[PDB]
Amino acid sequence: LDVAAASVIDNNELALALQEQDLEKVVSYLAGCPCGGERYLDFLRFAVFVNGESVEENANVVVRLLIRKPECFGPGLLAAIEEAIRIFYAALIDLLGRCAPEMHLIQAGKGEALRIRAILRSLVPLDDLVGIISLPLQIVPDHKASMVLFLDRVYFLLHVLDVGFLPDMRAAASLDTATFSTTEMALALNRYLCLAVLPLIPLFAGTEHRAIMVDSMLHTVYRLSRGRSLTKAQRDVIEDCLMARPSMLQHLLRRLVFDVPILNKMPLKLLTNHYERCWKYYCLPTTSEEELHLTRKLFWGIFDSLYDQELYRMAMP
């Protein structure tokens, strides 16, 4: 019947159009609600929005009705984790959090109605970070994806980043080889895709953070799910490299050189070439011996080979 609820998904005009009384009735049913109730709530949230972004009027009404009736599992995240350990309900709570996040205002102030924005903010606790911590503890997996989404919607990042990175690096080890064959990771892989966008967004910590980038490159190559998504992750890595940092440039550089040698698959080589171009751009002004060795590889690489050849040639140039 929802389903009948779905009847309305893609259309913007219809969404803008829906009357508030129906929303109120749905809210009441939700309040009365309970896994089924949670599912109903999720459907309601999808209905409330749909993107890109969310309708200001619809969002406002939903937020106000929700603030007015609290439902609302008594209150927290730690309790949910404990329940998970005992064992779902946690999934439903996550769905509610996700709905609230989708409900978040954009692009930015001002103004106003950011009140409003503030009421929602109070609504989160400590907060997106608490959610990240919960995610780390969990490291179900598909669950809390919204929390990651919510933090961005909801809102020193590196410290926060450190907790997130540890959870990640892992997936990569489990994913490749047999594990890659294993599909639990695939569910995990989808989350990884979401995280990268988030990824897209002292020095020693950054350098350690630099190790995570290498791990990410390793995950990217490979094994073996698409692919188009892989490409997106790759562009993000490329973007991260562009944003970047000599030491990070270095060890990553040696691993990259080894990869280049192996190449001299094809897509990986193209990515490496793009990275090299980026390094060059970063190198007008710009160890050195290692770089020279890598270059000799390029001369060697040209030798190894002797259209697609044309692109390879541009990379070589």
């Binding site: 005009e13 803008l16 159009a17 009027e57």
Partner: peptide, 10 residues
């Protein structure tokens, strides 16, 4: 007013 606003957004 809410209805009017929705119409305007339309």
């Amino acid at each position: 007013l809410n209805a009017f606003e929705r119409q305007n957004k339309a």
